[PDB]
Amino acid sequence: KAETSIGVFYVSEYGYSDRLAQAIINGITKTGVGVDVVDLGAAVDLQELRELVGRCTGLVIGMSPAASAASIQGALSTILGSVNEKQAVGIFETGGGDDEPIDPLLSKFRNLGLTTAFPAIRIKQTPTENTYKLCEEAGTDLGQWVTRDRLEHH
């Protein structure tokens, strides 16, 4: 009975995550689809985190630092076990220099049945406006997919 939303999970202030996620969110917003932002760096209630993922039709994940593995894996593992095959998920690199391998995570979601929301956004160089314009379009794509999924539901 909660508003149709897409969950955006990433570590705030890590690399260009803040701006990369914001661009994607702006693209989502255009479609009128809601969004819930969760900071992977800040401690979260595992049970409410499962509930949030549970009510999200779409998902967006930002890579975490390979330096905060121990502390971050708790939330990450929870998301992997709280997700369902009926949703779509997109993943972006941060350009922070300590990103965890994106591919391994991409494959974990695909193995679970989820659909890839958009081509995993990779950052090898400092983000440009063409970079953020790409995130914006990926955000829109997912937002449109979510809309079509809801309408294709009933």
From Swiss-Prot:
The protein's role, per its UniProt record: Mediates electron transfer from NADH to oxygen, reducing it to water. This modular protein has 3 redox cofactors, in other organisms the same activity requires 2 or 3 proteins.
Further comment found in the protein's record: By homology with NorV in E.coli, could be involved in nitric oxide detoxification.
Protein name per UniProt: Putative diflavin flavoprotein A 3
TM ranges: none
Domain (Flavodoxin-like): residue spans on this chain: 6-150
Superkingdom as given in the UniProt entry: Bacteria
Annotated family: In the N-terminal section; belongs to the zinc metallo-hydrolase group 3 family. In the C-terminal section; belongs to the flavodoxin reductase family.
Residues of the full protein shown: 260 to 409 of 574
Lineage of origin: Bacteria, Bacillati, Cyanobacteriota, Cyanophyceae, Nostocales
